[PDB]
Amino acid sequence: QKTLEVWIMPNSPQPAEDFKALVAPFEKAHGVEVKVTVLDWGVAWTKITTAATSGVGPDLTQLGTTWVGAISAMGVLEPVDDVLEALGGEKAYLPAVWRTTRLEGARQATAVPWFSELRAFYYRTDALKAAGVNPAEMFASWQGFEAGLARLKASSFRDPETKAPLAPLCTPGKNSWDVLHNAAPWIWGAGGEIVRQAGGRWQSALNSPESLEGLYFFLSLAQKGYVPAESLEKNTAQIEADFQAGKCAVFASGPWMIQRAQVPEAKGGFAERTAAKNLGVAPYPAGPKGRYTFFGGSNLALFNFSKNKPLAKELLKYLGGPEAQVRYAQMTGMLPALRSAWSDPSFQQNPLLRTFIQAAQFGRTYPSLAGWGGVENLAVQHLGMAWDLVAQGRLTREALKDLMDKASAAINQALR
Amino acid sequence: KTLEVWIMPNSPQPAEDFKALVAPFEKAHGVEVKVTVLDWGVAWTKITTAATSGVGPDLTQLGTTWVGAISAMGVLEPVDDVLEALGGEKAYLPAVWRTTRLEGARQATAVPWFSELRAFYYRTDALKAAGVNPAEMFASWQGFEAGLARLKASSFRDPETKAPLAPLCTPGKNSWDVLHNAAPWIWGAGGEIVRQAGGRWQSALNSPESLEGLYFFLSLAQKGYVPAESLEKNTAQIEADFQAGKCAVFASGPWMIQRAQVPEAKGGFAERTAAKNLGVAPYPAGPKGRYTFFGGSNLALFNFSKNKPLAKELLKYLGGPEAQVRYAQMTGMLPALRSAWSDPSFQQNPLLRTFIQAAQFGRTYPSLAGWGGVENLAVQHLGMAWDLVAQGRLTREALKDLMDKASAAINQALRHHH
């Protein structure tokens, strides 16, 4: 009785049940049972690295694209060049999705692209209308973005449900990997980066002039009262919930919210809510050095201590392939990792998703480095402490620089 | 034909386990109970939005500390009939009974479902390698400090990680437990979260005794017993770090005993060294008393439900002996119904006996109208108090200043909504 075990993060409103629906046609063809376990994003790094060093865990795990090099360099993943060749090799993926299949500079791929995800701004159509904000100008530039938040702060608009005003902007300040992913575009927009390569060695560029200019611009949005104090102690899920509840006019997120907007509360969505009926999407605004957003998603890896590798490689080919690529993106509201799958009507004929599709031009990835998991832990801890400077009214350019100096020294040790 | 219930993640497979629990009720009455799972972090947001919007489930799980707050919004159906039918006041601990209502309210608006109290998990291997007598470490603040100090100085390394253990991990950010973990130290020094200054309830977090207890707790991080990284983490992540063998001691509820029995593939940690080297001990006595957090979750019926008689049948079922025993087995929680603690499955589990025989020290928050806003503000402000230690800025006067601001904020929340 052939059995496979898969670890996933919560990609859909009913994560286990949807994934069971996705693999149902593969279970039927092979007479295999695919058992699924769901790990919260917060604990996923801990549980996946523990499986890696202990030698016990699933056949397959979901991996964030930014983690693939890091888990690969622990030497615990199976080569999957065979699976990727069978899915159509380098040509079948965006160059950026292809780079997340391997540790940077490795002979062999160690992960199969599963779904893509990039970031854009959800806004309340009713709130921006009542505030006199033209979205096309609010989302064009840093100048316009600040100008829209300031109109939204001063607006008399109140939510038809809460009978309370809306925070112009909510973003997470603690615990989530997004504390890093929400800062990345502001950093890139000012011409900076998280890391840079000098003499073949990567190092922190979080304390570079350009990185500090973008981070400072982002944090100073909270300084001016556009992000409420309470938001800076919250994690991604809580900010999502506050947008859904109609407490926030604007927030950065992935294409999945479009799907949740169509599905009732009882099935893990917010179709009942005022926000679901007053939903707009806009790209990140251009910085001084132009337009960028975070491009990520999740791949699938096979642990090299798996006992079911030929069968697990069949599951990878199936999950990586057109039918399952379309189906899971429909269930999750993600984009397919397989580029050919973007032409399916559920993505092309989806108006809010169109913004996410167009935003792929300006999408940017972290290099796929060995220490990258420790970089995200240190960046999240130290960016958390940078939001604290605003909550304490201690935000200065020199206090940010000091903070990022400490982060950079730590990130330089982690990168080796 | 159908009922909708919102639950939090009470068991390793929340939806699937709850469906197995109600299967006998679905079959007896020819109805479908649809279940939705809300994370603890978002539960207050989603439940208050359903309340003020007037659309939502028939039944929702509520934390015991939320029942007054949701009740005061006027959206919950009276359930005196269901509680009478389950035995009346006599069938429940008087502390569980106080969580069925807003403080001083005519009617019950919630049905006790399951109880939860906090004790210390410890690594038996780690305290043995450190020369720590657990009965001494967990008896008093002095012994607690002296055990953490032997744990810091111990050369013991985890068989899996081959790295030391942090003597203590406690969550510093964005979970309700930032409050529930601080409360016993506050209580132990003779302080409290709130006090009534003649009718009007108010923050007592800035009282001399509350500041003494909180300072004792915070100063454990100051001395290096809590690693700085732990102070930016939430409950889920500290749980995960204990399971992964990174912490010698952590405060939590009885559910971890159950997770220690269940393999990784089903949402537990039975394969981990921590599961095989697991000890339990109550909170230590402070100068003024021995206390721990007593909470749990009740079930409420929204008054805008269209299926009230049927949903009252589900409450009688879930509140009654059969279901009370079964769901406590599935979750590793304790039954809310007093009579269910007797069941031999509960007096046969050594670690669970330590939680059970600790209940005498369980204490509850008063069941107040604005208690939801109090938890948000206490978590935010106590978060910022952990920050003072991580940034090396914790002094008597910096804590006082900080808790003065916490108290002002909490006083606004206790009189009106956020």
Ligand SMILES: OC[C@H]1O[C@@H](O[C@@H]2[C@@H](O)[C@H](O)[C@@H](CO)O[C@H]2O)[C@H](O)[C@@H](O)[C@@H]1O
């Ligand atoms: O840094 C880890 C990975 O983060 C993923 O983004 C998820 C986001 O999709 C999700 O909504 C929140 C909820 O907490 O977790 C974030 O971490 C990215 O897709 C990956 O590229 C990245 O590797």
Ligand SMILES: OC[C@H]1O[C@@H](O[C@@H]2[C@@H](O)[C@H](O)[C@@H](CO)O[C@H]2O)[C@H](O)[C@@H](O)[C@@H]1O
């Ligand atoms: O503060 C609101 C409610 O919190 C519940 O405790 C849960 C705990 O049981 C769970 O393991 C963690 C996961 O983060 O969240 C805590 O908040 C209490 O049991 C309730 O009494 C309380 O009302």
Ligand SMILES: [Cl-]
């Ligand atoms: Cl590129």
Ligand SMILES: [Cl-]
């Ligand atoms: Cl970068």
Ligand SMILES: [Cl-]
């Ligand atoms: Cl489940």
Ligand SMILES: [Cl-]
């Ligand atoms: Cl109290």
